[PDB]
Amino acid sequence: PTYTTHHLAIPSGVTQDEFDELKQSVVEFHTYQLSQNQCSSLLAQRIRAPNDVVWSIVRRFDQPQTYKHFIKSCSVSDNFTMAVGSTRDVNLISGLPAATSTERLDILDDDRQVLGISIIGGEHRLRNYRSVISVHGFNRDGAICTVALESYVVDVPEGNTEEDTRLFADTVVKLNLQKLVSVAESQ
Amino acid sequence: CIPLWGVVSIQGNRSEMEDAFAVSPHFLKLPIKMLMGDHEMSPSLTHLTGHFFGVYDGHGGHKVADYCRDRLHFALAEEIERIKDELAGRQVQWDKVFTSCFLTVDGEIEGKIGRAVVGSSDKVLEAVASETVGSTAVVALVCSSHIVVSNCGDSRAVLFRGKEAMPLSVDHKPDREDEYARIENAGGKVIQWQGARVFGVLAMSRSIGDRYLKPYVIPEPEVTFMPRSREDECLILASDGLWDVMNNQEVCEIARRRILMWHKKNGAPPLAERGKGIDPACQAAADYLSMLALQKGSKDNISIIVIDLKAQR
Ligand SMILES: CC1=CC(=O)CC(C)(C)[C@@]1(O)/C=C/C(C)=C\C(=O)O
Ligand SMILES: [Cl-]
Ligand SMILES: [Cl-]
Ligand SMILES: [Cl-]
Ligand SMILES: [Cl-]
Ligand SMILES: [Cl-]
Ligand SMILES: [Cl-]
Ligand SMILES: [Mn+2]
Ligand SMILES: [Mn+2]
Ligand SMILES: [Mn+2]
Ligand SMILES: [Mn+2]
């Protein structure tokens, strides 16, 4: 049984002194069991906003459009209590190698500010995608900033390679983290 | 030069309409010093009227394409106003004009160029649509002298001259050898993810908008300055909702045969009323081309401008 090893490499965008603290949550949250012909990656984004308002955005499992790209519309299932086990039907915008996606909210921990979702259907080539977003505050001489960490694991589709899948999956996650920056620093 | 055109722009099996087009007859007064050079033959000929056609295949949303429809031709008119202040070469001169015009528009979409106000004050500075929204553009200027095509993306303009279809633009696809090299010489990557795609996302190498993929996806267009010929039959502008299911040669011939067929059954229409509005025979061919695209199975937005280049038939 193999496992991701993202604790071994300081991800782009974080200081050594921040990773000393972040290296702990990486092994706690952002570590997956690796099945054959799969792949994974870990991304991080410094946000100049308090880790409570960052989390306040990130947790809105029913408004992913607010802090994510490529969403045309998202609908839940009427009776929605934002509880683990919930689902949401997404429609993507045009011009993508994707058109819909069904997502299920697996982790929702307000005590540790960690958000986990597994994609369970839809029309796209990222089968068995699971992602974790954990928010981490910091303080440096009264300057309250946030480091967000997102990882994922996904099956590698037929025809493509691990680095294609990382390069495509990474590209979207960076973009989405880059927007979350702009939205949080705006509040 | 009496402009003869027809248009059909349909949503088809798409849930959203993101194609847009614009026809503007008699729009510009191109100075003759920008087309040919005086020889031994008309002192009264000092300017020459140009008609504008553009098709815009948006992706990710409609607001960039709609903007191109509403703004691109005024952008171009302004750039030709700046060259009327003076202060071969014509090919490069048109190259610059359209390069500037598309760059001006791209910047306004992105929110990096102020957009003019109607109260004559500070030019509004704001992005026109989101970061992920974009749009092709293929644009034609037709005057009695020349045809000038300016292209940015995978919409296409095909000229039917004699019996040979002649594309007036090359599709800006990410797997095109020169574009693949250009996107890597910029630091970008192209991968095969349900088609050649920049970073696995956008299936085109050039566009208007698409801020989030600057400076990989650029708005620099290929421009063709083509002298007209008595054997020119028609000029077609379309989005790829047609070209994906229909060969250039075939499209062009069907257009001609449909125009001819119309004139055979009804003859010509009153010369007084020719010019203002769509030409029935051009309309009938666009109508025929679009219904073929659907029944061949195109599941995309489809937009076609058919332009008859024969003085008479
Ligand atoms: C934009 C898009 C394109 C695809 O091809 C896959 C999928 C449809 C799942 C996706 O919504 C990707 C979502 C990703 C990578 C991450 C997330 O949401 O945390
Ligand atoms: Cl659709
Ligand atoms: Cl839009
Ligand atoms: Cl110039
Ligand atoms: Cl390729
Ligand atoms: Cl026919
Ligand atoms: Cl007929
Ligand atoms: Mn489109
Ligand atoms: Mn651009
Ligand atoms: Mn296509
Ligand atoms: Mn299209």
Q: Which distant-in-sequence residues (6+ apart) come within 8 Å of B306 by Cβ?
A: B5, B6, B7, B234, B236, B255, B259, B282, B283, B285, B286, B289
In contact, B308 and B259? CB cutoff 8 Å? yes
Chain A residues touching residue B194 (CB < 8 angstroms): 97, 125
Q: Please give the C-alpha separations between residue B105 and each of A114, B26, B115, in angstroms, as whole numbers.
A: 42, 22, 10
Only one residue has tokens 């007036």, namely: B168
The type of residue at B121 is: S
DSSP H or E run through B92: helix B89-110
Q: Which residues lie below 8 Å from residue B99, measured CB to CB, with a gap of 6+?
A: B220, B221, B223
Annotated domain spans of chain A: 1-187
From the CA atom positions of chain B, what is the Rg in Å?
20
Alpha carbon of B62: minimum distance to chain A alpha carbons (Å): 10
User: Cα(first)–Cα(last) distance of chain B, in Å?
Assistant: 15
Gap from CA of B31 to ligand 6 centroid (Å) = 39
Per-residue burial over B116-133, b = 16 or more CB atoms within 10 Å of its CB, e = otherwise: eeeeeeeeeeeebbbbbb
Output the six-digit token pair for A178.
Answer: 């880059």
CA angle, B196 then B197 then B199, to 5°: 135
Residue found by looking up tokens 């000229």 in the block: B159
CB B52, CB B27: distance < 8 Å: yes
CA atoms within 13 A on the CB side of B233: 21
Q: Distance, CA B105 to ligand 9 centroid (Å)? A: 9
Length of chain B: 313
Q: Does A175 touch chain B (CB under 8 A)?
A: yes
Query: Measured at the alpha carbon of residue B93, what is the angle toward residues B88 and B95, in degrees to the nearest 5?
Result: 105
Assigned token pair, B87: 């202060």
Resolution for this PDB entry, in angstroms:
2.3
Cα dist from A175 to A100, A157, A178, whole Å: 19, 22, 5
Task: For chain A, give the number of residues.
Answer: 187
User: How, if at all, do strands B164-167 and B156-161 pair?
Assistant: antiparallel
Q: Using CA atoms, how far apart are residues B199 and B193, in angstroms rounded to an integer?
A: 9
Alpha carbon B199 to its chain's center: 27
CA angle, A53 then A55 then A56, to 5°: 55
3-state secondary structure chain A: CEECCHHHCCCCCCCHHHHHHHHHHHHHCCCCEECCCEEEEEEEEEECCCHHHHHHHHCCCCCHHHHCCCEEEEECCCCCCCCCCCEEEEEECCCCCCCEEEEEEEEEECCCCEEEEEEEECCCCCCCCEEEEEEEEEEECCEEEEEEEEEEEEECCCCCCHHHHHHHHHHHHHHHHHHHHHHHHCC
Phi, psi of A176 (to 5 degrees): -65, -40
The residue written with tokens 């125009």 in the block is B259
Give the angle subtended at the CA of B144 by the CAs of B142 and B149, to the nearest 5°.
25
Of the candidates B69, B215, B193, B194, the one whose C-alpha atom is nearest the C-alpha of residue B136 is: B69
Contact check, Cβ <8 Å, B193/A125: yes
Mutational test site, ligand 1, from A88, A101, A107, A133, max ligand atoms within 8 Å of CB = A101
- Cβ of A168 under 8 Å from any chain B Cβ? yes
Coil, helix or strand for B289? helix
Within 10 angstroms of residue A186's Cβ, the number of other Cβ atoms is: 7
Please, which experimental method was used?
X-ray
User: How much distance in Å is there from the Cα of A168 to the middle of ligand 5?
Assistant: 13
